[PDB]
Amino acid sequence: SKTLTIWIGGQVAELDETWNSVIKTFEEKYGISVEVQLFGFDTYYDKLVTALQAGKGPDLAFADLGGWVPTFAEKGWLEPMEEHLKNWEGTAQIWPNLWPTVTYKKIRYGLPWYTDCRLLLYNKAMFEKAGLNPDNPPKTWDELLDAALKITDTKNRIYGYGVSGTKTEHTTLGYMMFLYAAGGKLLTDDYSKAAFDSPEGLKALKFYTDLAKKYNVSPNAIQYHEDDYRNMMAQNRVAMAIGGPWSFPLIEAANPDIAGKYSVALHPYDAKPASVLGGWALVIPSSSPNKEDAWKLAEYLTSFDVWMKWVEEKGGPMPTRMDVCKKSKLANDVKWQIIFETFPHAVARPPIPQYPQISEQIQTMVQRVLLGELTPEEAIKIAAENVNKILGA
Ligand SMILES: OC[C@]1(O)OC[C@@H](O)[C@H](O)[C@@H]1O
């Protein structure tokens, strides 16, 4: 009596014409009507939590691979998908580093649908205009700073490197990119304790925020993040940001003339190369009255034919299926060589129910420094203390 309802969230929800085509094909094939709701990234967690707490909303929902599935599963909000995955042809094709991201107490509660890792996204034409070689992007923090300073011309609203400092996950991810590039870690290996209140973590915090505050190579970091910077990049106003394969269809939609005029590279680093893992899974709420049809939709959406067509048309994000990654023409593109080589090393946000609260502490830490309310030393002390209380609660 309830129409099958899917909630699609995050940046990929902008590809609404592609989604409509995909869903219509499903309806034709299965004779099941689908109610679709699309959600922007920045408020999607709060909306999804609101619904799951109430026992209402979707039969199938997007959930971030960055800790949401363990958080929801711990509460009993999600239907287990072990039995379905055991019987599904596709299971052995999902990149294996993705299964821990949707696992709670050795049970899988989500089906990874797209994935990514984070990289330097940069604008070739802007490098060239500044007298830099586009095909030789910065490899180190020192080179990143030099290139960012050389490109920046704030008087003409031109910026070398966009720093995310909003109260959004992008800011945590930005800090993590620099933390791991400095040879630090977010939590201890057993997740019991904060690990970022270290000399490495301080160095990362100071450089990430200095790019915005001292060196002034970013638009206002308190107001803007990765997705804003990608759109500015399409206008040739921001030369470098953190991004990845989801960025590709989106930047090309914003400015079709930018095709071929942007690329990706391993993000510049200090002590160690770093990348962070991301993406979205499909989950079925335990309160759904339509659980079997919801699985049928998940199965269809994560099928070979659907993902082959998606990649053919849109060129991103990265399929969670190995066979599509390997059999599609993605590998012909140099952008994708870099992605496939980096992905297996990408570090994961901790797959624990505490993660969203922890991310909130990292966001606040960065913001308070950017706002001049706290020194990096003061901010990182407080954040780590709060994370340890969260983990001990
Ligand atoms: O694909 C980009 C993305 O949606 O950005 C936000 C992250 O939290 C997600 O995991 C994903 O990487």
Side-chain angles (χ1 to χ4, degrees), residues 11 41 64-66 114 116 118 169 173 246 278-280 349:
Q11 300 94 333
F41 180 69
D64 201 321
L65 296 187
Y114 90 74
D116 63 53
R118 267 169 166 81
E169 184 69 7
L173 290 161
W246 72 96
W280 296 79
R349 287 159 279 185

Side-chain angles (χ1 to χ4, degrees), residues 59-187:
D59 303 306
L60 192 66
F62 265 56
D64 201 321
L65 296 187
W68 299 15
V69 173
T71 300
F72 303 156
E74 188 276 331
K75 295 180 169 293
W77 287 351
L78 301 184
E79 182 79 357
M81 290 163 81
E82 272 310 305
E83 170 153 57
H84 276 130
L85 289 169
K86 182 116 201 139
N87 288 321
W88 183 48
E89 59 87 17
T91 299
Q93 287 303 308
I94 303 298
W95 296 104
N97 56 322
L98 301 178
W99 289 126
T101 75
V102 294
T103 296
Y104 172 74
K105 306 306 185 186
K106 305 297 181 172
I107 297 158
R108 289 172 289 186
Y109 284 96
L111 174 48
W113 184 77
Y114 90 74
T115 190
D116 63 53
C117 63
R118 267 169 166 81
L119 303 160
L120 183 74
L121 181 70
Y122 67 98
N123 181 316
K124 286 180 150 193
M126 294 183 75
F127 269 63
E128 184 182 357
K129 179 81 188 61
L132 304 175
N133 184 359
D135 297 333
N136 193 35
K139 296 169 203 155
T140 67
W141 281 6
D142 284 346
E143 290 170 357
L144 167 61
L145 178 56
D146 193 73
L149 283 168
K150 282 178 175 168
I151 290 162
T152 296
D153 181 9
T154 63
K155 293 309 184 293
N156 288 317
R157 302 178 308 113
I158 298 305
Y159 300 91
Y161 183 89
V163 176
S164 300
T166 47
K167 292 299 301 292
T168 65
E169 184 69 7
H170 315 83
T171 298
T172 299
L173 290 161
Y175 177 67
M176 286 179 67
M177 290 285 286
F178 282 61
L179 174 65
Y180 281 86
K185 304 176 316 192
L186 187 71
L187 309 184

